Amino acid sequence: LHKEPATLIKAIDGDTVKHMYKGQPMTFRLLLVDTPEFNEKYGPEASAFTKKMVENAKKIEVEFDKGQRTDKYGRGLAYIYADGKMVNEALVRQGLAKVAYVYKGNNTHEQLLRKAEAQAKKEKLNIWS
Ligand SMILES: Cc1cn([C@H]2C[C@H](OP(=O)(O)O)[C@@H](COP(=O)(O)O)O2)c(=O)[nH]c1=O
Ligand SMILES: [Ca+2]
């Protein structure tokens, strides 16, 4: 896989963010995770986590996997990096997302994320508390 440039347009919630990609606005849904909805427990905390990470970033990058690049709502499906740190992984490591939505062929970082999850669960962090 390869990283590609994007610039933040707006943080939306824990697992959705709007970026300008190839010069066009696109809402991205983070691959391989599920954050709680804002109205659910830890949802505001996930939203705030993601927002801080992407807002403070000097450099946003998008990384598509090998499969589907957009979902049925037209959202981009990617791994998102903030100054080289993967948002998707960081959410999981902090117990602010579960590994989820693992579809065959867009699952390159699955095992990386599951390892993060296991450590968040051992630590009894957030969702796992
Ligand atoms: C993360 C992800 C979600 N989706 C779809 C499945 C779910 O469909 P349904 O809307 O029919 O439940 C929805 C979950 O996203 P959200 O967690 O953002 O709601 O998005 C994909 O198709 N591919 C993906 O990789
Ligand atoms: Ca969600």
UniProtKB/Swiss-Prot annotation:
Where in or outside the cell it occurs: the entry states: Secreted
Return the annotated region ranges for Disordered: 109-129
Where Ca(2+) is bound, by residue? 15, 34-35
The record lists its disulfide bonds as none
Where is the sequence biased in composition, kind Basic and acidic residues? 109-125
Locate the active site: 29, 37, 75
Q: Note the superkingdom of the native organism.
A: Bacteria
User: What name has this protein been given in UniProt?
Assistant: Nuclease A
State the species of origin. Staphylococcus aureus
Q: What gene is this protein a product of? A: nuc
Residues included from the entire protein: 89 to 223 of 231
